[PDB]
Amino acid sequence: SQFLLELYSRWILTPAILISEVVRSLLVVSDLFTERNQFELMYVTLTELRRVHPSEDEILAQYLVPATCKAAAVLGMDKAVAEPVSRLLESTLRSSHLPSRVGALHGVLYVLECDLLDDTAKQLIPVISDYLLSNLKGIAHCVNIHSQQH
Amino acid sequence: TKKDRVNHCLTICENIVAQSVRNSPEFQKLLGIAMELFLLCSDDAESDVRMVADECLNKVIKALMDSNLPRLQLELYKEIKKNGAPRSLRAALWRFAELAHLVRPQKCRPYLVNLLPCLTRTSKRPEESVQETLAAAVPKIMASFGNFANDNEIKVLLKAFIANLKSSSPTIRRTAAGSAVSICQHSRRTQYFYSWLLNVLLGLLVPVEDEHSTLLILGVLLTLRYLVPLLQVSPSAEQLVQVYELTLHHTQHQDHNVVTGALELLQQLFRTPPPELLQTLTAVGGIGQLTARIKGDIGQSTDDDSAPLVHCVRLLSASFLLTGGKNVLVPDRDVRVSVKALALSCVGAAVALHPESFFSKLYKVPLDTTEYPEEQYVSDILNYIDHGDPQVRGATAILCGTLICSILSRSRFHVGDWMGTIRTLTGNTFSLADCIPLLRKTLKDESSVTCKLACTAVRNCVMSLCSSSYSELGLQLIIDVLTLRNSSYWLVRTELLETLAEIDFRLVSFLEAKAENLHRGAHHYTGLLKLQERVLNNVVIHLLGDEDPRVRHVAAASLIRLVPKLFYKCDQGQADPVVAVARDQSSVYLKRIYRGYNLLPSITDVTMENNLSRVIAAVSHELITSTTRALTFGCCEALCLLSTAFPVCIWSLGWHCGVPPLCTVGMATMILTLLSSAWFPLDLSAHQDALILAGNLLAASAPKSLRVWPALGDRALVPMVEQLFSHLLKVINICAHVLDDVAPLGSFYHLPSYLRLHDVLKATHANYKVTLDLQNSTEKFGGFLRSALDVLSQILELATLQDIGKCVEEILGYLKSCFSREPMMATVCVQQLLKTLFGTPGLYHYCFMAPYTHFTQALADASLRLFEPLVIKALKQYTTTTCVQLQKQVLDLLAQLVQLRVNYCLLDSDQVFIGFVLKQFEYIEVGQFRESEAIIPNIFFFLVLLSYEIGIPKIIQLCDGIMASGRKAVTHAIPALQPIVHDLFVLGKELETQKEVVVSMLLRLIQYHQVLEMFILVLQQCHKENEDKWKRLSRQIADIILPMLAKQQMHIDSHEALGVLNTLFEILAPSSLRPVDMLLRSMFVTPNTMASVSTVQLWISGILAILRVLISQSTEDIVLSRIQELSFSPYLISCTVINRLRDG
Structure with a gap:
């Protein structure tokens, strides 16, 4: 797992076909990172991408919102880390891409899971609380129509 | 006097046009003298003098193309023979090619003889x-002065230009090559003069092992890039194979100007091949039957x-772009990357012809296993995706497109069975799983020339995969082009939408239901992969809202190509996506009111009316809920191109939204x-498309509403028609005050809204009268005046005499000024008012x-006067005109003055107009007439309808000349x-003799x-007039056509052609078909040779078509008693007899 951190950073920092499938291989092995040295290198490569890679690449948009959010949970959810992580979850829930809606909601959990979260950033749980009320009243009667794993 | 010279030239111009007196013996002398003086103003060398006084000479011509054309063209031929200064002789030569198609064919033959002495001096x-x-004139002159010369005059002219291939200037080499090839399109015999230019040039390269003066080698290869587009006694099949071996020696002859000359000639002979040459290369033996840096045995x-x-791909690779030992690039130092670019586009156009070449070994005899470890195949051509610049990674982007096509x-x-045969023959390991990820990558490339x-x-490559076994990989390339919709190069976005117009989105919706991992894809998405609503809302309607006038026009033509191909879910026809693909491939393989509107019951497809009503739902939504100037402006251009391919009157249940709630008035209120x-009329590029579309939506109410404006009969519909008829008389009122320089019911004075429309029709009319260019489709006043006399026509049909009786004064004044600019559709405004x-x-x-069951149901039936100033001007x-779109609308204006009995006083004393129609029959038989095709159906309607008042004895002698002495028949x-x-069979003793004459000509x-x-038509009147005469005439054409059907003289090449011949044997009388002696000797026949698909077909x-008679017109009992007598052996076409004909 140390040999795979060196390889996938030099490709990011490659064609647009290979941009999307490299962010997805790094989120799966994340079960097996065994050191606090190893989780710190993961969060650094993913934030230099978003400011450089275009925002309208919605295949690439839905693998990285699961990727950037599981780093900041093992890491401290601190004031220099909350303001980059909290802003990215609000926008992708407004996206029209319905499998991009689903990857961004797993990133809510790990932030909400264990760390005693910052007091100003937990006032942005009513950002994520408001999205849940709107899509149950439409999927109360009919569930066969809308989706299954959304 | 340099500022004194400017004021002199410009005052002569205005005092000719403002004379308003032409064809006068005082006015004739004045125009000759000061016309040669307009060019001395250009001959004097100053850019303040040369630019100013050349645009002023174009003000004279265009205001006089109607009045004095024979006076204009006589002063102008004089200056070429003067052979003046190279600045004086040049700008006169623009003027004379644009007025070549304005001459008359009466005076044309004197103009041809005088130019060939003048056209050789300017070649020297x-x-x-x-x-x-x-x-840029020998294209335009000898296409209108083409047909008037014999075989003597045109052989002299082509020996001169080849002596202009013997010069060393690159500007002078390419102007003598496009002159030889524009004549042979128009000479006298278009196919006889193609074979004659190929004999002259190959003696300039008769046997190639000579010294050929390498400037003159480049003269012969540029006349051949212009003529191979035209090759599709004739040019022989052995004449064209001498062209092809001449170039492969010249892809090796070292230069950089001679290597690049024979590589543009090879890229174009595979794209548009001549069909004689095209069969000799795909064939297995090939050239062997016609005769009876590289370091290996290629095999010639x-x-x-x-x-x-198979030979020609081994040769162009090891010399230019591949080394025979290892997968390795060749350096750009050795071969230029302008020379490596034209060699990747020639390997791709042959795979579309012979696809077995790309899998071959590079050397036939292997090359020296001591030096090189392994031998390679031609798959290292596909390692030039990483090579540097655009047009090499982009021309190996296109080498993988037509290898899959x-x-x-x-x-x-x-793809399963065909790949097995090659691998045991040529042992390469190259599947199509290793080329689509090479094609998925160049779509994501950086440079906007590489994209x-x-x-x-993908225009060639995604209609062949998606219906194939590799249609897992075929759907992914539909997905990636959708990310290419927002790149900022305007040529990158319009070749996307052509590969999203050629998609069949009923075959594309079928693969989505079968996918389970492809819906996920990367990053494991949940939901459906909705291609269709994402490629129709977020590309095609979205690219209507682009800033460019180039990008907005191409997106409309795709919604003409998308609507038959949609498949929205759960129609009341096609249910599954399985049943959707099955109905577009069974229609293929199993079978006077104005132009706007319709009165039929209008049989229509129920499920094709559903796909056209979802494309006018999302299009009226980016026109009302839009926030930009650019969304409202280029989506009135996408609604005018639906209504000219999918008209509103035929498809009204698709266009219907609301109004009259039931034959529709769809969406015309916005x-x-x-x-x-x-705001919106102030630009003529899309105000002319909002007038052709508001007349299509008030005419589809005509089958319903018709029983102020008393014929409308629907008071919720009258303010829509009161407005456009108020809107179209104020736009012929601003086009009347512009064509005549006059200061500003229909009246635009007191409106400040339409004084803004007077400054916009005056910017587009100062560029026409100053810049002479006659043949433009898009002019934006000449395009705008075409739009507002087409739709003033379509409303008058709804009008009556009582509504127009206060306006017959009004609309006739404007057209006398609106006559000269566009008279083709200013009589279409006059043809309808008189109705x-x-x-x-x-x-x-x-x-x-x-x-x-459409088969068995047609077998049981087989068992069965303010116009007087305006009319004289037309x-x-x-x-005096020459455009034959205008000659067709003037023969319909005179067939309506004879039905509606206007007395024959248009020619009060003489017979001036009827004498001129007889002379035009002289120019069609010989062929000295340019566009006789679009006038010969309407020349003959005018003549027969006058004789009920030239008589029908004289009418039928003219038609007999055209047939036997003239051009072809169709x-x-x-x-x-x-x-x-x-007009003779449908509508005493004199009428009996003329019916015998017309039936003999058709035989x-x-x-x-x-x-x-x-x-x-002929057989249905004899069953009504006299049934004794009905059976005599069906016997005479029984023994003509059945001898033709055995010797295959009957042109039944179309499916328009088999439909006409089967409704004939129903209506032919069954007494003439009752002996089955004749129908069987015409049936059981063998053709001459079945080698060619002209003759197999x-x-x-x-x-x-004789077997539709033995099933209905005669039962089973009668047919087989006959073949016992007629020895028709079953070895007629047997497997021994069919084999010797395809070869023979």
Whole structure:
């Protein structure tokens, strides 16, 4: 797992076909990172991408919102880390891409899971609380129509 | 006097046009003298003088193309013979090619003889600026002065230009090459002069092992890039194979200007090949039957056991772009990257012809296993995706497009079985799993020149995969082009939408339901992969809202190509996506009111009315809920191109939204509020498309509403028609005050909203009168004046005499000023006013059970006067015009003054107009007339209808000349009789003799299937007039056509052609078909040779149309008693007899 951190950073920092499938291989092995040295290198490569890679690449948009959010949970959810992580979850829930809606909601959990979260950033749980009320009243009667794993 | 010289030239110009007196013996002398003086103003060398006084000479001509054309063109021929200065002779030569198609064919033959002494001197001139404009006039002059010369005059002219291939200037070499090839399109015999230029040039390169003066080697290869587009006694099949071996020696002859000359000649002979040359290369033996840096045995193009296109890919690779030892690039130092670019585009156009070349070994005899470890195949061509610049990674982007296009069409989508045969023959390991990820990568490339060439590779390649076994990988390339919709190069976005117009989105919706991992794809998405609503809302309607006028026009034509191909879910026809693909491939393989509107019951497809009502739902939504200037402006251009392919009157249930709630008025209430704003009409590029679309939506109410404006009969519909008829008389009121320089019911003075429309029609009219260019489709005043006389026509049909009786004064004044600019559709405004001033389903249904029962149901039936100033002006135009779109609308204006009985006083004393129609029959038989095709159906309707008042004895002698002494029949002779037969057989002793004459002429012409529609009219009157005469005439054409069907003289090449001949045997009398002696000797026949699909195709149409008679007209009992007497052996076409004909 140390040999795979060196390889996938030099490709990011490659064609647009290979941009999307490299962010997805790094989120799966994340079960097996065994050191606090190893989780710190993961969060650094993913934030230099978003400011450089275009925002309208919605295949690439839905693998990285699961990727950037599981780093900041093992890491401290601190004031220099909350303001980059909290802003990215609000926008992708407004996206029209319905499998991009689903990857961004797993990133809510790990932030909400264990760390005693910052007091100003937990006032942005009513950002994520408001999205849940709107899509149950439409999927109360009919569930066969809308989706299954959304 | 340099500022004194400027004021002199400009005051002569205005005092000729403002004379308003022409054809006068005082006015003739004045125009000759000061016309040569306009060019001395240009001959004097100052850019303040040369620019100013050349735009002023164009003000004279265009205001005088109507009045004095024979006076203009006589002063102008004088200056070329003067052979003046190279600046003086040049700008006169622009003027003379644009007025070549304005001459009359009466005076044309004197103009041809005088130019060939004048056109050879300007070919001998070494001025590189004088030689350029002649390659932009010998296209235009000898296409209108083409047909008037014999075989003597045109052989002299082509020996001169080849002596202009012997010069060393690159500007003078390419102007003598486009002059030889523009004549042979128009010479006298278009096919005889193609074979004559190929004999002259190959003696300039007769045997190639000589010294050929390498400037003169480049002269012969540039005349051949212009003529191979035209090759598709004739140019022989052995004449064209001498062209092809000449170039492969010249891809090796070292230079950089001679290597690049024979590589543009090879890229174009595979794209548009001549069909004689095209069969000799795909063939296995190939050239062997016609005769009876590289370091290996390639095997030349004479060898058998391999096609020559297997040979021609081995040769262009090891010399230019590949080294025979290892997968390695060749350096750019050795071969230029302008020379490596044209060699990747020639390997791709041959795979579309012979796809077995790309899998071959590079050397036939292997090359020295001591030096090199392994030998390689031609797959290192596909390692030039990483090579540097655009147009090499982009021209190996296009080498993988047509390698996938042409294996699927070669072996019929059997990528399993066809790849097995090659691998044991040439042992390469190259599947199509290793080329689509090479094509997925160049779509994501950086440079915007690299992205234009990789998206034409998906125009060829995603209609063949998606219906093949590799259609897992075929759907992914639909997905990635959708990310290419927002790149900022305007040529990158318009070759996307052509590969999203050629998509069949009913076959694309079928693969989505079968996918389970492809819906996820990358990053494991949840939900459906909705291609169709994402490619129609977020590209095609979205690219209507682009800033460019180039990008907005191309997106409309795709919604003409998308609407038959949608498949929205759960129609009341096609249910599944399985049943959707099955109905577009069964129609293929199993079978006077104005132009706006319709009165039929209008039989229509129920499920094709559903796909056209979802594309007018999302299009009226980015026109009302839009926030930009650019969304409102280029989506009135996408609604005017639906209504000219999917008209509103035929498809009204798709266009219907609301109004009259039931034959519809769809969506026409929004668009009048666009026009009544003072913002939207101020630009003529899309105000002319909002007037052709508001007349299509008030005419579809005509089958319903008709029983102020008393004929409308629907008071919720009258303010929509009150507005446009108020809107179209104020736009012929601003076009009348512009064509005549006059200061500013229909009145735009007191409106400040339409004083803004007077400054916009005056910017587009100062560029026409100053810049002479006659043949432009898009002019934006000449395009705008075409739009507002088309829709003033369509409303008058709804009007009556009582509404127009206060306006017949009004609309006739404007057209006298609106006559000269566009008279073609200013009589279409006059043709209509006189009408209304004188009153006038589940995949068993579709594949079998619905087409099986149209078969058996047609067999049981087989067992069965303010116009007087305006009318006189339109007759002076027909004698002096030359455009034959205007000559067709003037023969319909005179067939309406004789039906509506206007007395024959248009020619009060003489017979001036009727004498001129007889002379035009002299120019068609000989062929000295340019566009006789679009006038010969309407010349003959005017003549027969006057004789009820030239008599029908004289009318039928003119038609006999065209047929036997003149051109072919399907343009001239067969449309000549459609006016006569319908007006003689349908509508005492003098009338009996003339019916015997017309039936004898068609027997000489039975061979054509348009002549068999005229003869279904003849048999239906004899069953009504006299049934004794009905049976005599069906026996005479019984023993003519059945001797033709055995010798295959009957042109049944079309499916328009088999439909006409089967309604003939129903209506032919059954007494003439009752002996089965005749129908069987015409049936059981063998053709001459079945080698060619011109001859295989007419023998199997004689067997399908005499077999519709042995099933209905005679039962089973009668047929088989006869063949016991007639020894018709069953070895007639047997497997021994069919084998010797395809070869023979």
